[PDB]
């Protein structure tokens, strides 16, 4: 399952583009890896974060992965939902269970990720 909506990332993420923003999860082969998520840490919004700089734990029942951050740029939105209900992380990776709202400090940065044809490759390369 990898919609071609949105950009992928090596680490098993997704961007989805809106506007100058882009909402980021991580991906349905993520969560399978990861089993039942039970809590999900957010990252403060309005900081400013740089290119592959960890800023979010989603902690399972297996082990918490750092979630990093795309591209460089802002937290501009954080799910709340995932505090009171963190599995929607497992039911709907891609929909309801996106993280966080990020803004790139420059969207050409986005052109330098995976699309579903890049993220598929890398799952059958790590297979």
């Known amino acids: 399952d ?3 909506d949105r ?3 090596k680490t098993h993420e997704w961007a989805l583009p809106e506007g100058d923003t882009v909402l980021v999860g991580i991906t349905d082969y993520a969560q399978d890896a990861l089993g039942d998520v039970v809590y999900v840490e957010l990252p ?22 750092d979630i990093y951050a795309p591209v460089a740029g802002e937290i501009v939105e954080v799910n709340l939902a995932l505090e ?4 929607l992380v497992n039911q709907d990776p891609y929909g309801e269970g996106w993280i966080f709202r990020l803004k790139p400090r420059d969207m050409g940065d986005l052109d330098e990720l995976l699309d ?12």
């Open 44 to 65: 403060e919004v309005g900081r400013v974060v740089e290119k592959g700089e960890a800023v979010a734990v989603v902690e399972s029942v297996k082990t918490a992965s």
């Open 2 to 4: 990898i919609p071609k």
């Open 84 to 87: 009171k209900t963190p599995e």
């Open 116 to 127: 579903a044809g890049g993220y598929q490759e890398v799952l059958e390369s790590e297979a």
């Open 7 to 9: 950009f992928y990332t």
